[PDB]
């Protein structure tokens, strides 16, 4: 079957319950070519997941759904079996392999849940090709409704909260935030954007380029200097990777930092998130559930030498590369979803109305 | 080691700054209210140069007068500045031939132009050059300095764009050419005959116009009387590798800044970089020239304000604005990305965007100036709009109720100026 | 089935084991179970009879014509091709981990991936800073003593690493539409000398990508017998593990 | 004379161009030596001329680099020492007592010797500051504690190294981006056997819930107890205050500046944008404003304790210490 | 149409004046229902447009948040009725009867709030109120009818001294009351045990829109750990999300140097809300508004 990926380096004791891998190490070196245990589409998807070729939550969900559509297209039913059970049982090893390549995000988890519910709902009397076409159409409709129309509705809602001459602070890279700002500029709002970035990913640069290509004035700085720039900031617009049932915002590490500093500077905090990223689970801190990236990414060339080179030689030295953090609901003023403008405490309510 | 010397060429033998350069030499042009030669001298002094030779031919009297009044000519300066003036100078090759004839340089000097803005420390480059001289019996003669940049940066002007082919292992320059109006680049395979590995083609280099040379460079310039510029010497040395190889190396910097002001586009880009603190610690508020008239205070959004400015009510300075001492600003003005010299007078409801105003400029109310340059004591009347890329030189007065075209150059000299004028654009 | 193994032969067993066995063995250990071999017929189409005595898992042999090129022989077996093709030659004797090449075809959705090795009419190989993306493909035959690079290529990639002495392994991962174009345009005769340079040139003008893996451990012995001894000199070195 | 002028010019140029003395204690020692040489070599008759000369020199050095408050602190300390010696040799603070119950032109031959010996005593006390601060490490660190640090502070490094000789604890170091000097602190602490963690500033809040106390250094201490620290320290202080985590500032007494946070636009040190956004970005650099402040302002209400060579103090007492070191007339300088 | 703007305003003012006890929102809803009664239309699109224009005119008559909230609630009621019945003729009668029942319920809402809220006042308590509020007056009446003894502090409400009116109305039923300045809320906060105020409008996130002195009163109550109770009717639930004080629409601040008439109070400064739906946390208002609009 699929071998288990080996943990890389020594982990902090508080984070010893989480996996930590090496970017260079790949699971496919011990896997057969051509791929037989794992579908080739899933092999390629896991390869680009582990190497970080696709990183955004929406991008990861879209790529996963495209690979799943390819798998459904290539799938055939075995004799004396039903698709509703065989497909569900067959998809699980692929998702385990994907998790081994990189831990699944909340959007991908929700997509997996939706697809499993759709496949289980397939009738036994349904024909094979009819069922496959219906599954592919359902995946396409899910992508459409949960991404494109949701983003358009969120942009329309957020247009009302952007006025002429205000300063908006953004963090990292978020497709929803970039689209919101681009359409707000297009409809005639005149403003400037402040971009905050953090090491080692430096994803915010991406957004910066987009703004430069949209004509929107922009500024760039790192997270430690955020407290310097918030006095001139009027609103803070933050993207979210997940919304938890208690109203907490699970996002890129440093988001709760910006929310806290904005509260200290009396700046309202706005969070935009599609309802398909809402999660029923709860989380009070960043230690119980998180992702450990490659520690070697923390090495930086300052001057002529790298201080963290060969850091594993020191027995007591540890390198922590946290991926996500949790912002408590008391630090968020407003959540903008395709359903409208709601408080954080209204997050479970949406979870109640989407399910039934 | 022997004391580090430097050869400073205070004459731009090209003619890219006409008609602006007729009255004032290019080396004395104010970029951010400070002359370019001041930036070059500060860069040379900061990097450890103890002796600087200044060669000026065109308008050398003004250059000498300005230099004798500067900080670097004081007895307390650690970089002694010497002035050598000759009216027979026609190119950099002539200057280097004169240096070789007078034997001014003893060993491992620095070659740079008078319009170079930089904060580069060449100590590592100097050490590498000296080590490769000692190891390889003085075969190497020149190490050029390049800045790791991108082809799309504003500082990468088309005229001075360069593409190079080097040996990655030893940083040896194998091929060197300019990309002026070329869609294809040809590289002979003769360099590939040197070795099967190490050949790398680089187009991400910005020519800082800084070199670490040897007296052998001056000797070679003397031997080849046809050598006029540095490019001629580099190309002649590279093509004639069969006999007396005399390898040329290079050094690339990624954290420091270096550029040359060779045209108006480069002037604008370098001024924007200086205002935005890209050449730190060479910043307007640092006052690296010890003069009381150029002092200023730095404030949020890169706003530099000099003494006794008295900004008018309702006027807004958005960002990247430098104000000279004594400048007076009217009411309901809008200045952005602009440098204004000392003693300027600005009317009301005037919008300045990406403009450069030198000392003595008076602007009437209601003017709209975008991406334009105004020289000493220039005048602008009421209801005057300047389109981008306009130049006014040496006390030009522009009449009211007109709109200049984009590429409008006006100077008191008839022929060179495209639209010669005295008090208006209509004859 | 992301790959179909295909072997070109247009070979005489010069070694301890038959020369064709080593590529077959490599494909067998890497995970392949169905292999397609095109055997020479210029002298005698008896290579199928010779290979019928082998103990490999599964082989499908097809006799070629009197004279044909590599691309022509690829066109010969088009009905037998349904997915991306892993094209190899009988002369390959290496201990490469094929995932070092196949991954380049997987992660980047490459149009073509190739394997080359450091050396002991030269070929000019131009790669990018990462050393994986192939930007330039040249041979001295087509150059008039001047190597020409387009300005847009340097605009997109301002650093090009040039290799002069490098040995191609003739191991190729090719997409289906590459073979479709090969049949559409019959001008191409050999994949090694025309098709790959054509793809590298078409890389910069629906996106086309070329990737190459550079190795520094072992390579295949060339067709000339001069290197035939050298492979033997390494054969016993590599026969212990394999 | 000439040598003193060359030394002064070299010091001013080094301050203007950066670099020079990496250690703050080394810079204070060099400033004290320069002031001693000025007093010895330059000719003066009475205390007024000496005070004016010292004021001019201190003004020049402060204008050379306003962010380096140690030079101005040394100048004001020397001025206060001169005032104290003159008052002791000639005669015998603003308060309600002084308000209710109700001339430096005189010359004395032995005043210069008293000034020089007082300066020498100040230097001697300066030499032993780090050990004095580190001797209090055991009173503030218990077994199996978790300590959070930012950047590279030599005083905090000595504190932790002295504490580790007898107690076992964990230290978390945040790399003070862009100049990630926290890596050097982390590797130095790991070389001493302390278990250390490396993380970015973006995680400062995230791990703050598992931190027992915060020990940090500072560049300057203001008259109200506020801090001029490395950038990102305000966020760390806010995170510590959110969890009521005690924040300890290990700062020597020579970093106290009688200035107030009223000054603006000169507090933070702005350096080249290359540290934040590289020059290789290209065209987008033409229309993007990049600012890289080096220092941050920390309000006094976010600081729990100040540890100096004289012991531990609350921020609310800082003014009294500032009254004991500097005369109110020398604040403007 | 059948009813003109002039007589629409006249009916609104007459219904307000005839019964001074009835709130502005109830009178506006009654006027809208009367407008629907005599419309002489046959298309639900024209009815919706005419009702929107009537609501615009009524909000132009008086700039209270409650009137706009009632208008939006009426529009949602019309949309729901149209969704239920496709035919306009069958829909109109259903709308009329449902509006009559809605009027009855919004009339009983005040007594429901008083009955559900009077229990939170203890014997010997000190209740702090801000200005005049009929709901607070009815709550205190119900508390007094329960044989409970308590003291009341009111603020004078400087722009228009409605606090004096509230004090007189409370003295009418023999309640020990005191009048303090608007600058004495923080001074008197330590004496009070709990705070009860009215609300002109309940925003989406659970905050309230109220008279200009409400926000500082709530902040002072929070600074001293005092419970802050709000009594408000259901028809004052509005889908508005003000981020700060400046974010409040200008049509509610003025005409009702600079003198705003209303302010916004965040849900974090509110302990509980007493409505005809019951005792709710501020988070329940958002749930109600989400459930109403699908």
Residue numbers in the entry:
A (entry chain G): 166 to 521
B (entry chain I): 40 to 466
C (entry chain E): 1 to 10, 27 to 136, 154 to 238, 259 to 295
D (entry chain D): 8 to 99, 106 to 115, 121 to 351
E (entry chain A): -1 to 254, 268 to 305
Paper excerpt:
After the recognition, eIF2 is released from the ribosomes as the guanosine disphosphate (GDP)-bound form and regenerated by its specific guanine nucleotide exchange factor, eIF2B, a heterodecameric complex of two copies each of the α-, β-, γ-, δ-, and ε-subunits. Various stressors such as viral infection lead to the suppression of cap-dependent translation and the activation of the integrated stress response (ISR), since the stress-induced phosphorylated eukaryotic translation initiation factor 2 [eIF2(αP)] tightly binds to eIF2B to prevent it from exchanging guanine nucleotide molecules on its substrate, unphosphorylated eIF2. Sandfly fever Sicilian virus (SFSV) evades this cap-dependent translation suppression through the interaction between its nonstructural protein NSs and host eIF2B. Here, our cryo-electron microscopy (cryo-EM) analysis reveals that SFSV NSs binds to the α-subunit of eIF2B in a competitive manner with eIF2(αP).
We successfully purified the SFSV NSs protein and determined the complex structure of human eIF2B and SFSV NSs by cryo-EM at 2.3 Å resolution. Two SFSV NSs molecules bind one eIF2B molecule and are located between the α- and δ-subunits of eIF2B. We were able to assign the amino (N)-terminal ~200 residues out of the 261 residues of SFSV NSs in the cryo-EM map. The N-terminal region of SFSV NSs contains a β-sheet, followed by a helical core. The interaction of SFSV NSs with eIF2B is mediated by the N-terminal β-sheet region. The β-sheets and protruding loops form a concave interface that embraces helix α3 in the N-terminal domain of the eIF2Bα subunit. The interactions mediated by the eIF2B subunits other than the α-subunit are limited to those mediated by eIF2Bδ R321, which interacts with T35 and H36 of SFSV NSs.
